[PDB]
Amino acid sequence: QEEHLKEIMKHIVKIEVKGEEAVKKEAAEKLLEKVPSDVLEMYKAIGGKIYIVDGDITKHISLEALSEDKKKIKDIYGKDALLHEHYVYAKEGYEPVLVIQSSEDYVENTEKALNVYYEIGKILSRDILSKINQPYQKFLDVLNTIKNASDSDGQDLLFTNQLKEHPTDFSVEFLEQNSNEVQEV
């Protein structure tokens, strides 16, 4: 009994108060930490860099003037959300830019970090690797093995509806003709 008290004690009693705004800066930096550093160097080399805003992501100089129409985004779960409510958006162009909304709850929860990591991969696959066409047969080979496997819900996990309806196995032509579909997966 005397043993147990210690562990609970440390977790609840935060000895000192970091401050009102420090936590925000500390949260984001820890988040980006988990992604392998080597990825960050690739991002800077191709140009634009991620800057963390604090207010409503909906209203920023860099993003206000562009893509108002593309207000429809699909989350990881495939559900559509309006951008203003959403807490992180990215944009692909001549100046690759990624913007993340500051918050204090990135360590504690996980559902928010997942979207951030989701956004890092699309930049990685669509904007980085595309200059070298790195997704190729090896990615295609695993891909093909997924379609044909015993009642594998894995498909449900990674394929959209369009893919679950291609009757035969995937062909190198599809990636060429359709290259948006593969990059999300």
């Binding site: 147990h4 562990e7 495939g78 449900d156 996990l157």
Partner: protein, 528 residues
């Protein structure tokens, strides 16, 4: 290595955000709720408190409940972490017998009761059959040779009913019979070292296959334990009903042991220490949907005033109904196997009322049925949902209904002859119908009531195929039905319990004259 303050197996983040366990071919592992891959498989989205070894506070941990390492007897709907699992025992009296310290043996029907300022104590209510098994037994006072200076003996048979959600093991509750407002006739002994069996939820003890426990010991404890002076018998004649109040002192609790999976009863933990917590940190929902019987469930709601207690995931009423009873949304419309949520009344205690009037204001709505899914539950509110279609008495038991509903339920004549009707009516109706009045109408407006006595109405039976069968020869002269005119109308009236008379009137009238009777059938003589 992942933090885990409550030390309950599940890591923190999972508990707050939502998780679900799903078996991969033969191995069970715990996983975060994924919207697309779990929904097609029909798994429920769990939430819980990272700081409660059992969010509900009952003796089963948050982890154990959803995984099943638990007494396999807790009813299914209570495996969900936000549903308190606890026992609820009440007593059912099947039949009585009377004599004097010429024996009145009548069959009884009992009901678990609930009244209004209603408190956390279970109670039931017996109702004595009034129909006359014997023709000649007018005035019980004489059928039993009871004199002013006599005493009658009472001898009952009893069975136990578990309508809760968890098993009791060793003890069996003490329970005291009480007549009237405060004249306690007897306290039913707690038989000793005799309830070595188990009372699982939704079961009877003793089971339906055995004789029910005779109430009198048949030993030497008291020669006639249930004595009763003359004066009670008089009061007994005017009310024809008793109440049986029982307390909640149950036995020990069966806990799950991880080392070998054996379920052994620990003699340290006792249900009498847990119930107060449950009764003080959950929302109370009263429901009469299933079989027009009151099923009680308790749901964990937040209480702003308590730090630790605010940790539990917020529960919105609609969601509560989803996990506690089985309501679902085929088309997004709340319904219980078809019956939409809108066919029920909501009544609230004054305390509970105050909280809800506030809640309806910040949403700017007047009809609760729309914004229903936006009402937050706080601790200690008590909510009662009753069928809007039926009439009710003081003890919130179903006693009647509007006549109009009654007729359509009878508009289906499967067959008709000169010996009776064989209907197939919804099993629920025959709990608000006391009996039927048969009458014949002369071509010139006369009226002949066959069973023209207050205590002679129970003539309608039910066949083994669920077909109700009304027997005329029961309270007839064992003779078929005569008709003086193929043009003479035959009228049949039904009498609901609420509209019944239980004793002869002031001047001892026995005719069914001043009884409000509803016409239920009227066909031509030739047609029959």
């Amino acid at each position: 290595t992942v933090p885990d303050r409550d030390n309950d197996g599940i890591p923190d983040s999972l508990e707050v955000e939502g998780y679900t366990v799903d078996v991969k071919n033969k191995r069970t592992f715990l996983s975060p709720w994924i919207s697309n891959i779990h929904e097609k498989k029909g798994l429920t989205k769990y939430k819980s408190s990272p700081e409660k070894w059992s969010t509900a506070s009952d003796p089963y941990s948050d982890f154990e409940k959803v995984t099943g390492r638990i007494d396999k007897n807790v009813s299914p709907e209570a495996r969900h972490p936000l549903v308190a699992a606890y026992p609820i025992v009440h007593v059912d009296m099947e039949n009585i017998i009377l004599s004097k310290n010429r024996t009145i043996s009548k069959n009884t029907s009992t009901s678990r009761t609930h009244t209004s300022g209603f408190s956390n104590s279970n109670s039931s209510t017996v109702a004595i059959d009034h129909s006359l098994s014997l023709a000649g037994e007018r005035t019980w006072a004489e059928t039993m040779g009871l004199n002013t200076a006599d005493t009658a003996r009472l001898n009952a048979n009893i069975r136990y009913v578990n309508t809760g959600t968890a098993p009791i093991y060793n003890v069996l509750p003490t329970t005291s019979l009480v007549l009237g407002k405060n004249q306690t006739l007897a306290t039913i002994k707690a038989k000793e070292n005799q309830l070595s069996q188990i009372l699982a939820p939704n079961n009877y003890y003793p089971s339906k296959n055995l004789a029910p426990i005779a109430l009198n010991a048949q030993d030497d404890f008291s020669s006639t334990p249930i004595t009763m002076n003359y004066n009670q018998f008089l009061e007994l004649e005017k009310t024809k009903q008793l109440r049986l109040d029982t307390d909640q002192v149950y036995g020990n609790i069966a806990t799950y042991n991880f080392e070998n999976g054996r379920v052994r009863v620990d003699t340290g933990s006792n249900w009498s220490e847990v119930l107060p917590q449950i009764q003080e940190t959950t929302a109370r929902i009263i429901f009469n949907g299933k079989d027009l019987n009151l099923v009680e469930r308790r749901i964990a709601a937040v209480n702003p005033s308590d730090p630790l207690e605010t940790t539990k995931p917020d529960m919105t009423l609609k969601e509560a109904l989803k996990i506690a009873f089985g309501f679902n949304e085929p088309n997004g419309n709340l319904q219980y196997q078809g019956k939409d949520i809108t066919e029920f009344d909501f009544n609230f205690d004054q305390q509970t009322s105050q909280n809800i009037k506030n809640q309806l204001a910040e949403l700017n709505a007047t009809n609760i049925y729309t914004v229903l899914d936006k009402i937050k539950l706080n601790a200690k509110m008590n909510i009662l949902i009753r069928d809007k279609r039926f009439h009710y008495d003081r003890n919130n038991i179903a006693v009647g209904a509007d006549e109009s509903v009654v007729k359509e339920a009878h508009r289906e004549v499967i067959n008709s002859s000169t010996e009776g009707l064989l209907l197939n009516i919804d099993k629920d109706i025959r709990k608000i119908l006391s009996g039927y009045i048969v009458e014949i109408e002369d071509t010139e407006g006369l009226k002949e009531v066959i069973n023209d006595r207050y205590d002679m109405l129970n003539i309608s039976s039910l066949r083994q195929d669920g077909k109700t069968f009304i027997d005329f020869k029961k309270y007839n002269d064992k003779l078929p039905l005569y008709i003086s005119n193929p043009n003479y109308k035959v009228n049949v009236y039904a009498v609901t319990k609420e509209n019944t008379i239980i004793n002869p009137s002031e001047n001892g009238d026995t005719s069914t004259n001043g009884i409000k009777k509803i016409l239920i059938f009227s066909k031509k003589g030739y047609e029959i």
